[PDB]
Amino acid sequence: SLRLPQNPNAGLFKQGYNSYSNADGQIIKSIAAIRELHQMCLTSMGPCGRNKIIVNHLGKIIITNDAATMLRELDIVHPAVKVLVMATEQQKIDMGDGTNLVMILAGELLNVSEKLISMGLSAVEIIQGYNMARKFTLKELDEMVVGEITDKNDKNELLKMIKPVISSKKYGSEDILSELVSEAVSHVLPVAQQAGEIPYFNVDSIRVVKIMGGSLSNSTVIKGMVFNREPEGHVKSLSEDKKHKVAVFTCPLDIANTETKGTVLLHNAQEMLDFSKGEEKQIDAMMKEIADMGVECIVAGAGVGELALHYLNRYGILVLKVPSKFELRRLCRVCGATPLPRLGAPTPEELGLVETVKTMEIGGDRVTVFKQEQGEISRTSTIILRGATQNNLDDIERAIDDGVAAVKGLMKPSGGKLLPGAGATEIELISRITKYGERTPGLLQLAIKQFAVAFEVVPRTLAETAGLDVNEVLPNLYAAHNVTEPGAVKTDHLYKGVDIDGESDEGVKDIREENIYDMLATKKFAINVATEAATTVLSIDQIIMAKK
Amino acid sequence: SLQLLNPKAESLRRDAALKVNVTSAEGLQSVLETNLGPKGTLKMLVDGAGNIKLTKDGKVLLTEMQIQSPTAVLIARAAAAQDEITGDGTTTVVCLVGELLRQAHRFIQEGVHPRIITDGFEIARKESMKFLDEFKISKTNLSNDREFLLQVARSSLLTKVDADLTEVLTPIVTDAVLSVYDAQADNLDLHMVEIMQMQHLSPKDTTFIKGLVLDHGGRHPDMPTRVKNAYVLILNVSLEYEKTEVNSGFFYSSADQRDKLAASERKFVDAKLKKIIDLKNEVCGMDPDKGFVIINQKGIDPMSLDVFAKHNILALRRAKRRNMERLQLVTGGEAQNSVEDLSPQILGFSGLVYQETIGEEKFTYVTENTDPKSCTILIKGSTHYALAQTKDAVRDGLRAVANVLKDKNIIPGAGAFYIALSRYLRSANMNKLGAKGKTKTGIEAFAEALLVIPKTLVKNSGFDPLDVLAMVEDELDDAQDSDETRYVGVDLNIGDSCDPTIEGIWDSYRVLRNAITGATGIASNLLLCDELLRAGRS
Amino acid sequence: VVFMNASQERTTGRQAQISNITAAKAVADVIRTCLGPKAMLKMLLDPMGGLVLTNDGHAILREIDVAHPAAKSMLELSRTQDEEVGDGTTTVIILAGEILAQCAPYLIEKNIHPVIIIQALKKALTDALEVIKQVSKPVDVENDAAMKKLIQASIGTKYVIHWSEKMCELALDAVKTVRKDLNFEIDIKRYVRVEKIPGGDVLDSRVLKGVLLNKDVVHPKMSRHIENPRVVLLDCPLEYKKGESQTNIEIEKEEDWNRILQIEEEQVQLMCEQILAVRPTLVITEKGVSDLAQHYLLKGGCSVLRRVKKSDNNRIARVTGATIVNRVEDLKESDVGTNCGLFKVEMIGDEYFSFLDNCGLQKACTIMLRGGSKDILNEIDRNLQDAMAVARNVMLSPSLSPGGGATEMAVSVKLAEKAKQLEGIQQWPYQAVADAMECIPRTLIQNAGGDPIRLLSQLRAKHAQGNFTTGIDGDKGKIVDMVSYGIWEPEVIKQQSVKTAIESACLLLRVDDIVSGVRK
Amino acid sequence: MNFGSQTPTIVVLKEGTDASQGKGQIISNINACVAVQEALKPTLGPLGSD
Amino acid sequence: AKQHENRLEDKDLSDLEELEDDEDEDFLEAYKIKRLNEIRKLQERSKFGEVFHINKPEYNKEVTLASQGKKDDGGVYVFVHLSLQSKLQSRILSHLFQSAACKFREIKFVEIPANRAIENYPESNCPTLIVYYRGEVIKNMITLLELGGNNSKMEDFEDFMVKVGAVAEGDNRLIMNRDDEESREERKLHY
Ligand SMILES: Nc1ncnc2c1ncn2[C@@H]1O[C@H](COP(=O)(O)OP(=O)(O)O)[C@@H](O)[C@H]1O
Ligand SMILES: Nc1ncnc2c1ncn2[C@@H]1O[C@H](COP(=O)(O)OP(=O)(O)O)[C@@H](O)[C@H]1O
Ligand SMILES: Nc1ncnc2c1ncn2[C@@H]1O[C@H](COP(=O)(O)OP(=O)(O)O)[C@@H](O)[C@H]1O
Ligand SMILES: [Mg+2]
Ligand SMILES: [Mg+2]
Ligand SMILES: [Mg+2]
């Protein structure tokens, strides 16, 4: 009476282990545990989304509007929330686009599932309901698609691609940020029209180097690349035309020492006199074959000796440090050189082509530039990103990664296959999925119905973040789709969507003239991985933890 | 969910609460079932103060030992209500609740709801009452035969002490209810018998006294211990004033008034005592072999003992409250508080009164009454724990023989009713079902749970329970076809069936009533319990 | 420089409401399985050590101390429902939780203001009382056969449905005794006595119209069986009353001290002679009695019982009609009670019990409950409180309604028809009230072990045809009408439930900040 | 059947009660008296010391 | 554990009779004889009951010898009052002595003028309260600002007697423990 028996036969397992079954409203608590961090994602979707401060134990801060990025640093206790972390991590790695959606959709599927489990629907039927809804959802995304790119390189078409992507992360001004990406995409692409070759594009080609100071308007697009290096011997503006040559060596510019106990041995004074001059003549003789080929800059892979440096700057050969593997490989793609570890003569076919190598003051420190010209184009271009706050450089840099990741979406599938944005793609599926529930019989119809209700969060979120009342903006938009397709062809009610700024009522003046669209490849895997996030959380009825 | 309301709370729900209820009942069963029957073991309740006590009744074992588990508290409270109204059968209650929860939990694990299981117990309980009222037998107690009361008392006292002490003590129980009887009013009091704790020769040297025995002796040596004819006189007011209710004080004017004011208190003592002296010589003056004793509840003045000592008056003090009712029943007197009115009619009578000096105290013995309506039992023993052991034996044996007079019906014992009730609760054809395939699960569980009582007796004796019950099963198979009503029992000496009526084992009617009713109710409510909780402010 | 000794930090915004609504859901989860005929039982471990086995809602909530302050508003609803009626306590908690649970995704999702929801609940409550008035009907109150099945409705959830034939007669005779003519039924539970006697059998019981005392006579010469007793109630002690003035006596003469104790005997003599002026046979006093006064009352046969409680003396007064008089001088023949009989003291080894029976319309009785343990005696005693609690409202008002989820379903169907007809901003929370009444039918079905998705789906189509008396059976789970079985409750239980559920939701929905550390 | 995990044995005498058998204790008692005896050894006699 | 002790400890001889019908006689009457003996000891110790207006020669006996009492260490507390009729606090303290004298008859209450007590005593330090016990001074109290000053009450004076060990904490005569009959009447009704 004074004390319970405190759960007998509990010594089967350790004291730290705990069980968590579906009963006792614990599945409702797991939905509430998702609801804690899901509401943090509400104020971070859209162009009016607000970034987030995350102070780690080390003190490294990253300020951001992207889900997949923010969830990396937060240490999570609940395992069901970690499914959303790895689900968004999969979204960032594969497609690099549509991570908030993975978070906001899969969290709302668990929200509407709170009503379904409370009604009395078995968990097995819930998974069958969303799977049958998923097959119809992915089917209709291919049907209501409009428009295509059909050209890899164009000035006006890239404005339709990059601009709606970076509009979520650090909107700012539209033109100054979009032109930096569309100019850099055209440099790296192998155009090669009327040849029948397979296109190819690498995410690691376009890379952004962060430099403090300046303003966002002063950002330029560099053909080549840049490091924060200092030439050792001398600096040269290189005002001499008639382009220079480039030779890349991965080994250090020094005498190849013996790997096993390299030690001097001098038996008599005759070897003592010649050993000091032998190293000078040997290093000089190797530079003669290198210098006669007309090379004026050599990129070293490791530490360079002083004696080798004395003969390099004699003939005015520039030295560059790249003490890492990937930093040396990225530079060969610009000039198109084939490195060889030997210290002999570079082959003439393997020598690279760089016209000028300038050294100027940008951020107060010494930097080396490798700008090419219109002739003999190169790939793996960089973007000089100027800003005042280092935290803003980090989020804008990842926005270029999201934009570069969106360019990857054009290579693998047959084309662009753009969709209407601004909630139009979500609100259209609500009517189609609702009609699909009426066609199918059985107790799964409520699962199909709640699956459509979960898609309202995109227009509800954009209306809440835009400082508008969602009770008036949302049903005003339903009137455009409650007047369904009459007998006249070429109906233009599909482009109606929400609006962040402007006219009252809100149905946007089309997403058309506005030139904002969404990618099909992002919506396919996002709805697939979001449904898998809700499937794995709803399919499990018992959870076991340890130590907490 | 409960942690959100109170973080310091706990809850076991729907599988952990069921194991707690069954394991606590089986744990209470495994410890306390050993006392069942004559071959049971003795327990030593050794508290922190070193007090030793021997007993076999489950009431006093659970009363001294505080219960930590919440389930066994409910079973201990059931044994309290059983021992309170009846005073026997506590070991059968805990075994039935333990077996009912065991047999029920065997079916709850098979996927059966607790509701229809408890519904079958109630129908099985009501079916047993329709079996019990036909199974009982009626006897005529107007003859007041001693042989039937002895063997009925021997059946109850064998489960407390060994055989040689039972034969000495079993006439003491039958002698307790000799004169206490009323045919018309049907009133029979159990508290009129007086249990005195004292150390003497041995437990096996006790004896029955017809009259009353008080634990107070004569204060003065001059008064005679031997009195051949005594007229009792009941007093209740204190001859020695303890305090004056109204505050007052004697302020004397001079030294001559000091002894006079001291004599003022002597006048009020002599005023009420003069009527006592006048009461003595009113009957007959100068009559040898005729004393006069006074029994007072409150204290007596030591200054007044000289007045009682001169006239040879036995005076006792600090008597009990319940003894005032016992004086008039034994001696035939009349209770009085004051001394304003006195007469020889109100006085009782006694044929012999004597005292004995045992240790540093003296006990007053009043015997040889004409028609006493009460008696007493001296609990002699060789130690402190034998007094409590024999006291529990008499207090448990008085109820078994007293119920024979309260209701003439009596059930044969030796597990006869539990064995016979098993067959009757096998197949309820169309009498009381209520539903198809639902109630019958509880009928089977209730029938199998009642047969643990004869098996527990065999486990204490040291034989196999299934072997000795097989011949009991084979006996009753042919008894129905032989056209002869025969009751079979369980003999623990040789391990063979037997006849209770022939040998002499019986059980009271009210024991099996409250035991089955109390066990079925507690077994039902514990099965209905699906969650245990705790909450409060430390 | 904290500026505040009481929670300078604050939990404001929506997170305070999540803690409030989730706490309101948690108190309903621990008693969700405590509804319907197949409901389970609970056990509580109080710190004092007195265990109790309960299924009624009021006994569960009152013995559970909760640290969450927002939850405690839900804990007190069963306390409010108990003192008002005494029946239907569990439905108020789960209904209030479903209203709060259904109204949760509107500030999060729709961002509708709370004060608009407050207006929505009042119009729903106004329509809820309207349709309950339409669904209810009157019946005859004087038919004893009809009253048995209404008392059996609340008893069906409890353990004593197996003795429902005895419990209905046990409660119907008791409530009719204390009932009188004059809100037309002014009788009160305080007059009804229920003494718990461990031991015996629950089947053997009877409604004795009297006052059961738990003590023995003070003197052994007194006769315990009186044919024509005469009750006289007293407040003065038979002992000598000590004066509060602290009077001291200066004794100079020798005869003064003897005269004082003689005046003490003379005062008790004169005091007892005035008791015998009206020659009673049974005397009752709430204070002590001296041994000197016992002797003088033997000649008159005035049986005395002492240390009787103040409430028991009032209950003795209403039965026998005796008037409580303190002083012994004002005893008249009218003061002496009459029309009493069957005074007998049954000998039981535990304690002495004395019975009373009759031959100023207020009356009283004492229900002697027999059982197997003190804890289940409290269970049967609380069922008696529930047995008469359901009987008061049918006697107060002749109005009566069905139950078993049917009356709650009728509210949801009528609200759902007019919810689409409203067509305004308040219609979103107005639909939540219609969905909030579905927990009760659902709860009943779930406990019964049926499939609630299809049983309630056909129940929607069944009530759409235009009938209201169709409920859900608790054993097997049919859609059979309750007219055949006879599940009927008063209207006051459902009226108090929807009122207390709405009024409790209005209290808790308008909280946005939580603070502590005041230490008043 | 048992109440708990283990059951430690009872010491017959109370905890801390000193007791010993054999001829060692009576020699210790004699040596204790001789220890008191040595204090009064040089005190005996007219030339003794206080 | 305390529930068993409250039956006997929290009931006087007048209140112990309440448990005569409920509790056992031998359990109750065994303690009533104990409490009855304690009441008899207080009556024998009641050697006082009014303020002893003394003078100095006598101080050397009344104040100190008394403090020894029987010298069985039968000590006796002796509260002295160096009265000064010109001061307002002195007349208040004189009223408290006579009020407490009627209640606590075992404690001796002594009063004397302050001008006659000590040679050239400071009038500002009066009224003075001294407490003797077995010849030793237990408390040399200063003017009544500690006890409220001009607003001193009988409840404050009785609380001071408990601190010096003159009266037990749970004594039935103290106003803190002596609850009114109307107070206990409401408790029984609401119980
Ligand atoms: N200026 C705008 N007007 C209308 N809708 C917009 C605007 N900018 C963005 N959107 C919509 O907001 C949505 C936000 O998508 P989001 O998940 O943030 O993309 P990302 O994966 O880059 O984070 C887009 O799908 C787009 O349709
Ligand atoms: N001599 C006996 N032989 C066989 N059975 C006995 C004997 N004495 C008692 N019993 C059985 O023991 C059961 C309990 O008796 P008893 O031990 O007196 O009560 P308790 O178990 O409460 O102490 C009875 O039902 C009876 O059948
Ligand atoms: N056998 C049954 N069949 C259908 N409904 C029942 C049955 N038993 C109880 N109910 C319903 O369950 C409700 C229980 O009421 P009650 O137990 O008195 O208080 P609470 O509703 O607080 O538990 C009743 O209103 C009744 O409508
Ligand atoms: Mg995007
Ligand atoms: Mg027995
Ligand atoms: Mg109820």
Tab-separated table of C-alpha atoms in Angstrom, chain A residues 1-6, chain B residues 2 6 8-12 17 20-21 67-74 529 531-538, chain C residues 42-54 59-60 63-65:
chain	number	residue	atom	x	y	z
A	1	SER	CA	0.000	0.000	0.000
A	2	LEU	CA	2.871	2.352	0.823
A	3	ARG	CA	4.851	1.274	-2.273
A	4	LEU	CA	4.067	-0.688	-5.419
A	5	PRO	CA	6.021	-3.811	-6.447
A	6	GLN	CA	7.618	-1.487	-9.120
B	2	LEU	CA	0.290	9.728	-16.274
B	6	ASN	CA	2.528	13.829	-12.065
B	8	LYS	CA	6.518	11.222	-9.594
B	9	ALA	CA	3.641	8.810	-10.426
B	10	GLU	CA	3.773	5.277	-11.834
B	11	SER	CA	1.387	2.976	-13.675
B	12	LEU	CA	1.258	-0.699	-14.679
B	17	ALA	CA	-0.910	-5.191	-13.275
B	20	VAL	CA	1.271	-8.339	-9.986
B	21	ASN	CA	-2.206	-9.416	-8.865
B	67	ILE	CA	1.707	-6.050	4.064
B	68	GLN	CA	3.668	-4.068	1.469
B	69	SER	CA	1.942	-5.323	-1.696
B	70	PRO	CA	-1.409	-3.656	-2.549
B	71	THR	CA	-3.094	-6.884	-3.686
B	72	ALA	CA	-2.414	-8.901	-0.520
B	73	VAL	CA	-3.791	-6.044	1.610
B	74	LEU	CA	-7.177	-6.707	-0.004
B	529	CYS	CA	-8.646	-4.537	-12.017
B	531	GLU	CA	-4.376	-0.870	-13.822
B	532	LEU	CA	-2.618	0.014	-10.556
B	533	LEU	CA	-1.815	3.653	-9.732
B	534	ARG	CA	-0.233	5.695	-6.942
B	535	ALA	CA	-0.479	9.413	-6.226
B	536	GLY	CA	-0.147	11.794	-3.310
B	537	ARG	CA	1.805	14.589	-1.655
B	538	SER	CA	4.809	13.591	0.456
C	42	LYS	CA	-8.592	0.695	-10.843
C	43	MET	CA	-6.484	0.763	-7.672
C	44	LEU	CA	-5.040	3.830	-5.926
C	45	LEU	CA	-2.229	3.944	-3.337
C	46	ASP	CA	-2.815	6.935	-1.082
C	47	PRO	CA	0.121	8.001	1.144
C	48	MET	CA	-1.886	7.281	4.309
C	49	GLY	CA	-2.144	3.614	3.225
C	50	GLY	CA	-5.918	3.229	2.823
C	51	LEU	CA	-6.465	1.455	-0.485
C	52	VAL	CA	-9.659	1.792	-2.514
C	53	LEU	CA	-11.020	-0.125	-5.532
C	54	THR	CA	-12.948	2.337	-7.708
C	59	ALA	CA	-13.371	8.715	-6.678
C	60	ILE	CA	-10.550	8.379	-9.233
C	63	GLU	CA	-7.507	10.835	-4.749
C	64	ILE	CA	-4.923	11.749	-7.457
C	65	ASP	CA	-2.819	14.840	-6.767
